[PDB]
Design a protein around this motif. Structure first.
Motif, PDB file in Angstrom:
ATOM      1  N   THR A 155     -26.882  -5.106   9.526  1.00 41.76           N
ATOM      2  CA  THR A 155     -26.746  -5.748  10.857  1.00 41.76           C
ATOM      3  C   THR A 155     -25.691  -5.268  11.677  1.00 41.76           C
ATOM      4  O   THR A 155     -24.599  -5.189  11.002  1.00 41.76           O
ATOM      5  CB  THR A 155     -26.693  -7.413  10.555  1.00 41.76           C
ATOM      6  OG1 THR A 155     -28.089  -7.848   9.744  1.00 41.76           O
ATOM      7  CG2 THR A 155     -26.318  -8.089  11.869  1.00 41.76           C
ATOM      8  N   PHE A 156     -25.930  -5.007  12.714  1.00 40.51           N
ATOM      9  CA  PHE A 156     -24.912  -4.323  13.569  1.00 40.51           C
ATOM     10  C   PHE A 156     -25.294  -4.893  14.897  1.00 40.51           C
ATOM     11  O   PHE A 156     -25.857  -4.641  15.820  1.00 40.51           O
ATOM     12  CB  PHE A 156     -25.253  -2.657  13.836  1.00 40.51           C
ATOM     13  CG  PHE A 156     -24.393  -2.108  14.702  1.00 40.51           C
ATOM     14  CD1 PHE A 156     -23.019  -2.091  14.325  1.00 40.51           C
ATOM     15  CD2 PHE A 156     -24.454  -1.398  15.862  1.00 40.51           C
ATOM     16  CE1 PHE A 156     -21.898  -1.351  15.040  1.00 40.51           C
ATOM     17  CE2 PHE A 156     -23.618  -0.735  16.685  1.00 40.51           C
ATOM     18  CZ  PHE A 156     -22.368  -0.782  16.245  1.00 40.51           C
ATOM     19  N   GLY A 157     -24.579  -6.286  15.352  1.00 40.85           N
ATOM     20  CA  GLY A 157     -24.620  -6.772  16.584  1.00 40.85           C
ATOM     21  C   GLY A 157     -26.139  -7.548  16.330  1.00 40.85           C
ATOM     22  O   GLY A 157     -26.507  -7.974  15.165  1.00 40.85           O
ATOM     23  N   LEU A 161     -29.938  -2.488  13.844  1.00 45.48           N
ATOM     24  CA  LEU A 161     -29.526  -2.428  12.313  1.00 45.48           C
ATOM     25  C   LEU A 161     -29.199  -0.683  12.595  1.00 45.48           C
ATOM     26  O   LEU A 161     -29.480   0.056  13.352  1.00 45.48           O
ATOM     27  CB  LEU A 161     -30.958  -2.030  11.580  1.00 45.48           C
ATOM     28  CG  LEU A 161     -31.458  -3.413  11.389  1.00 45.48           C
ATOM     29  CD1 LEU A 161     -32.713  -3.303  10.337  1.00 45.48           C
ATOM     30  CD2 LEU A 161     -30.576  -4.573  10.849  1.00 45.48           C
TER      31      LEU A 161
ATOM     32  N   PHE B 157     -17.281  -1.468  13.515  1.00 44.11           N
ATOM     33  CA  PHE B 157     -17.982  -2.146  12.648  1.00 44.11           C
ATOM     34  C   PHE B 157     -17.223  -3.102  12.020  1.00 44.11           C
ATOM     35  O   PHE B 157     -16.623  -2.911  10.800  1.00 44.11           O
ATOM     36  CB  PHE B 157     -18.563  -1.081  11.546  1.00 44.11           C
ATOM     37  CG  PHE B 157     -19.693  -1.761  10.704  1.00 44.11           C
ATOM     38  CD1 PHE B 157     -20.973  -2.132  11.258  1.00 44.11           C
ATOM     39  CD2 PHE B 157     -19.641  -1.894   9.518  1.00 44.11           C
ATOM     40  CE1 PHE B 157     -21.719  -2.532  10.611  1.00 44.11           C
ATOM     41  CE2 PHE B 157     -20.663  -2.320   8.490  1.00 44.11           C
ATOM     42  CZ  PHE B 157     -21.803  -2.644   9.170  1.00 44.11           C
ATOM     43  N   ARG B 167     -27.728   7.892  15.397  1.00 43.82           N
ATOM     44  CA  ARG B 167     -29.045   8.083  16.336  1.00 43.82           C
ATOM     45  C   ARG B 167     -28.234   8.550  17.553  1.00 43.82           C
ATOM     46  O   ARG B 167     -28.815   8.906  18.423  1.00 43.82           O
ATOM     47  CB  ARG B 167     -29.471   6.470  16.522  1.00 43.82           C
ATOM     48  CG  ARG B 167     -30.268   6.082  15.396  1.00 43.82           C
ATOM     49  CD  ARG B 167     -30.847   4.675  15.758  1.00 43.82           C
ATOM     50  NE  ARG B 167     -29.627   3.769  15.781  1.00 43.82           N
ATOM     51  CZ  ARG B 167     -29.610   2.348  15.888  1.00 43.82           C
ATOM     52  NH1 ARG B 167     -30.889   1.929  15.880  1.00 43.82           N
ATOM     53  NH2 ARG B 167     -28.615   1.700  15.822  1.00 43.82           N
TER      54      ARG B 167
ATOM     55  N   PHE C 156     -19.458  -6.060  19.164  1.00 44.77           N
ATOM     56  CA  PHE C 156     -20.298  -6.590  18.441  1.00 44.77           C
ATOM     57  C   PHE C 156     -21.463  -6.049  18.346  1.00 44.77           C
ATOM     58  O   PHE C 156     -22.429  -6.545  19.210  1.00 44.77           O
ATOM     59  CB  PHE C 156     -20.218  -8.158  18.444  1.00 44.77           C
ATOM     60  CG  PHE C 156     -21.496  -9.178  17.700  1.00 44.77           C
ATOM     61  CD1 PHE C 156     -20.879  -8.926  16.480  1.00 44.77           C
ATOM     62  CD2 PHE C 156     -22.213  -9.521  18.211  1.00 44.77           C
ATOM     63  CE1 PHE C 156     -21.638  -9.767  15.444  1.00 44.77           C
ATOM     64  CE2 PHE C 156     -23.021 -10.359  17.237  1.00 44.77           C
ATOM     65  CZ  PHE C 156     -22.925 -10.361  15.879  1.00 44.77           C
ATOM     66  N   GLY C 157     -21.809  -4.962  17.755  1.00 42.41           N
ATOM     67  CA  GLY C 157     -23.127  -4.230  18.159  1.00 42.41           C
ATOM     68  C   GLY C 157     -22.857  -3.230  19.530  1.00 42.41           C
ATOM     69  O   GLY C 157     -21.751  -3.197  19.858  1.00 42.41           O
ATOM     70  N   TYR C 158     -23.920  -3.015  20.243  1.00 44.11           N
ATOM     71  CA  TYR C 158     -23.816  -2.260  21.359  1.00 44.11           C
ATOM     72  C   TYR C 158     -24.140  -3.257  22.377  1.00 44.11           C
ATOM     73  O   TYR C 158     -24.697  -4.141  22.545  1.00 44.11           O
ATOM     74  CB  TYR C 158     -24.791  -1.313  21.510  1.00 44.11           C
ATOM     75  CG  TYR C 158     -24.539  -0.164  20.572  1.00 44.11           C
ATOM     76  CD1 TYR C 158     -23.376   0.433  20.298  1.00 44.11           C
ATOM     77  CD2 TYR C 158     -26.040   0.195  19.850  1.00 44.11           C
ATOM     78  CE1 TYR C 158     -23.481   1.588  19.438  1.00 44.11           C
ATOM     79  CE2 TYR C 158     -25.662   1.432  18.692  1.00 44.11           C
ATOM     80  CZ  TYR C 158     -24.585   2.047  18.578  1.00 44.11           C
ATOM     81  OH  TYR C 158     -24.327   3.160  17.876  1.00 44.11           O
ATOM     82  N   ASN C 160     -22.094  -5.724  23.757  1.00 41.09           N
ATOM     83  CA  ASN C 160     -22.005  -7.156  23.509  1.00 41.09           C
ATOM     84  C   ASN C 160     -20.519  -7.484  22.713  1.00 41.09           C
ATOM     85  O   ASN C 160     -20.160  -6.397  22.058  1.00 41.09           O
ATOM     86  CB  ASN C 160     -23.150  -7.658  22.495  1.00 41.09           C
ATOM     87  CG  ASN C 160     -23.289  -9.117  22.246  1.00 41.09           C
ATOM     88  OD1 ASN C 160     -23.970  -9.735  21.767  1.00 41.09           O
ATOM     89  ND2 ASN C 160     -22.407  -9.837  23.574  1.00 41.09           N
TER      90      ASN C 160
ATOM     91  N   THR D 156     -23.237 -11.966  10.190  1.00 39.77           N
ATOM     92  CA  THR D 156     -22.431 -10.781   9.834  1.00 39.77           C
ATOM     93  C   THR D 156     -21.757  -9.985  10.831  1.00 39.77           C
ATOM     94  O   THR D 156     -22.080  -9.477  11.852  1.00 39.77           O
ATOM     95  CB  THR D 156     -23.501  -9.931   9.248  1.00 39.77           C
ATOM     96  OG1 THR D 156     -24.375 -10.446   8.173  1.00 39.77           O
ATOM     97  CG2 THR D 156     -23.231  -8.639   8.604  1.00 39.77           C
TER      98      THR D 156
END
Ligand SMILES: O=P(O)(O)CN(CC(O)O)C[C@@H](O)[C@@H](O)[C@H](O)[C@H](O)COP(=O)(O)O
Ligand SMILES: O=P(O)(O)CN(CC(O)O)C[C@@H](O)[C@@H](O)[C@H](O)[C@H](O)COP(=O)(O)O
Ligand SMILES: O=P(O)(O)CN(CC(O)O)C[C@@H](O)[C@@H](O)[C@H](O)[C@H](O)COP(=O)(O)O
Ligand SMILES: O=P(O)(O)CN(CC(O)O)C[C@@H](O)[C@@H](O)[C@H](O)[C@H](O)COP(=O)(O)O
Lengths: 254, 255, 254, 255
Positions: A155-157, A161, B157, B167, C156-158, C160, D156
């Motif tokens: 889980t990434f945000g 993924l 992260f 990617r 938080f992820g991309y 965001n 998470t």
């Protein structure tokens, strides 16, 4: 030897399975140094929508997988969702697959291990690499001897993924590691990243790759976006075998 | 195209340290003729966490040291700038001007680097999505840069951890040459055991070069002592990535 | 007393500053137990696009802020982007603001601290709460005595940001803490979450709130999506003061 | 609307432990008449990390213990199920059937709970975005559920860490009543010092209830010994959240 787990995401019909099984049989004959395992789910038990395709049931599914193993002599693997399904599925499945969201369900893992079959646990999107050590322990406690851990992203945000390739060498400490090339790019997916990341997986070092393949992905009843076109499977396998041959010289010890 | 290997000690601890590493990089450049080597070292660590950590001996000393490396070994040079005024003096010796990850969005710094006529390599911020580097390249082109590089060095992260989303390599390749930072992508905001495996992944995916900090005795480094690669291990790593690149190359997708 | 830092994101013109300053002056008169600080940037030095609005420059900006402080007697704050700007800005700014991306730039922090003014550092989206301890140390080393740390979200992820409210009590160990209510919901933003999260901030406990406000957000030359409509400022301030009054009884010691 | 407080020991260590906590919850229910209390305890910890950790004494023993609490104190009951077959036997005592976070997407489990006619509370998976709970509610409604709750318990954030994105409260409120899990949202996949501050945030933002694991002596718990709230502290926490809710309530946005 290197493991290649492939097949259509869901058992849309044994008709579809036979066609895919035919191609996988051809590849297994072409690549003798690779152990092919035919994969397909008899039920998509965790779809987001209640109105989505689930499948034709456990009975119809086990029946279809039977036809594939008998008609092609290919090993079989499929996933279970509740403890009672382990026994009936074990009648055909050489490797019992544990879904990612269920990798911590003790009874499911024990039920799988009790069948005597090999067990492949999909690493939950919420699990850290080092926390799979306990997953393996549960299985060993349950009697499992052939254990696999499959990397399928973290889980990434939201709705994304990421694949932390550091997980491959970490998980290798306690189990054989498989890289799921199709779901790792899926967005809770861009097919454009499937091949690039598969190359990364073998360059880093893993014991096998997992790939969903379909004759006509666009017409697939599930994962119509990420399922690899059947015709492209041979090329990708040859590619990862060549990369592995050269890179393996550098794989770190245990 | 010739693969780029940017390497050198993290910080300019002394002109002597530079010449020692420069000697080895020159030797490797003679062996690996298919590689374009660029010697790297920072004249200042302007963003250390602690006010007590080593920063350097100043720009004047650093540029002078780098110039000695270039003069003595005939190696291309790259170093990073932290404020706009440093672009001009640095451009006198640096073939490639590096923009720190935290400063990848500072317009004037990017513009200052671009007008020097030198190549510019921007470290992708730990906060930046791959697709957002498109505007970074646009700023540089707007400012006159003709040779632009984007360096992947991990993404935030959770706390004190970076993940490499591979990617990003094919995404960024759409608008600039891409470099993979093998040493900073594993450091915990330093697990050296992951440096080699991740660099193998980078070349298998496909990139235009790699960035590696190397020191004769990492344990004695004044910066990134836990992530700098021992100089004696550089040759083997380069040979390995060249081998993997070659076998994977026919499969690299067209952008 | 509680701190309320507000004003238009960018100095679109001293004309705009005066209008906002007029309202902020009125509120400062209405809420005597609140220390108001007028904020506005003379330059958006980190826009994503080279074709975006940056401002009218440092000179025009300092000039405008001067007019606000002289005409309303309000404290001033603005952000600097390079070390040389600290001195000239310090002539007007009561609090010098350090941008989030620049919270680790040693010389920028030292240049700000050398002016003798108060310093407010926006916590980088890449920084862990506990790692702000070193940020404060740099400033103290540089001579700063009035130091603030501003929570503005974490990567938080991309594209965001998430606000980990655990950061408030953690940062309070070494500095006064300000909650940035407008940029914390911004997507590298939904105005619908501004008020809810501000309420959370005061319920948890902070020393002040930071809010970008504009007479006509939609017509703003920057952050037209998240800038709070000037007319809504009074209501939000009264709301956070009431929540703080009740919740403060439970704020944990240091 | 009456605020919901779901509380109890994490696991049914023994029927005695349950009655002890039940006694205190009953006392608080008499004091806080504006609150609807629901006694919670798990008959099985079916997802412990280690095969060596405490799981419980079986469903039969657990349901019997919960029934004693309901009979003796007249308290509503809630417990979680792990496989579909458990829905029926559990529904005999549970007023609210809880769906574990990792199982929030398991269709048959959700359907099994919904057809019992009982209320259903789904813990939002650590992998799920707030807007994706809309389909979770749809599944439950499709299955016959008329009283549905969604529980925020963190997301998470890197490895071994959860963050609470409070924007989820107003987002989920669009389709179901929302509960905030004050004890599991701070546990490291257990910083007790953040339990109280985060619960204050939840009520200030606005939710329909809170979920808290409580034990007479947390240090001696057989599960979540680091996150369970000492029973003696429950009254004070409830009083505090009721006070904050009241003062913040006039500002709660309309969905
Ligand atoms: O447990 P995992 O998600 O890794 C496994 N796989 C099976 C496999 O390995 O082929 C199941 C997935 O197909 C399943 O979880 C899907 O990703 C899930 O149904 C997402 O679909 P959707 O309902 O359209 O959002
Ligand atoms: O801007 P980046 O962080 O990518 C670049 N590099 C330069 C390079 O590419 O060699 C600067 C780093 O050396 C620097 O940020 C360090 O990683 C940082 O100072 C870490 O050290 P510490 O103060 O101990 O936290
Ligand atoms: O350094 P920070 O981002 O917290 C501060 N603020 C200033 C303030 O506190 O008002 C600067 C922001 O306005 C700035 O970073 C913007 O968020 C940035 O320009 C994003 O804009 P965009 O170019 O449209 O993507
Ligand atoms: O499904 P969730 O994790 O939200 C729910 N809860 C139940 C509850 O709400 O009380 C189950 C938890 O008790 C369970 O997941 C624990 O947090 C987990 O077993 C942690 O323990 P550990 O084995 O030591 O890693």
């Amino acid at each position: 030897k290197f493991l290649v787990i492939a097949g259509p995401c869901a058992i849309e019909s044994e008709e579809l399975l036979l066609k895919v099984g035919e191609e996988i049989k051809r590849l297994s004959e072409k690549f003798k140094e690779v152990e092919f395992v035919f994969k397909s789910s008899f039920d998509k038990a965790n779809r987001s929508s209640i109105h989505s395709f689930r499948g034709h049931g456990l009975e119809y599914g086990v029946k279809a997988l039977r036809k594939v193993k008998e008609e092609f002599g290919l090993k079989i693997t499929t996933d279970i969702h509740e403890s009672w399904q382990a026994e009936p599925v074990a009648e055909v499945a050489d490797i019992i697959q544990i879904p990612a969201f269920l990798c911590r369900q003790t009874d499911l893992l024990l039920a799988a291990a009790k069948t005597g079959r090999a067990v492949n646990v999909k690493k939950g999107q919420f699990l850290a690499p080092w926390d799979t050590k306990n997953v393996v322990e549960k299985l060993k406690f349950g009697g499992a001897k052939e254990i696999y851990l499959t990397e399928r992203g973290t889980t990434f945000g939201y709705n994304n993924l990421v694949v932390d390739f550091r997980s491959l060498p970490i998980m290798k400490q306690w189990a054989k590691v498989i890289y799921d090339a199709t779901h790792s790019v899926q967005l809770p997916g861009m097919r454009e990243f499937i091949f690039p990341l598969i190359r990364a997986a073998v360059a880093v070092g893993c014991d096998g790759v997992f790939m969903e393949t379909h004759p006509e992905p666009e017409k697939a009843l599930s994962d119509a976006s990420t399922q690899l076109p059947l015709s492209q499977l041979e090329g990708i396998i040859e590619a990862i075998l060549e990369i592995r041959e050269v890179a393996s010289k550098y794989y770190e010890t245990i």
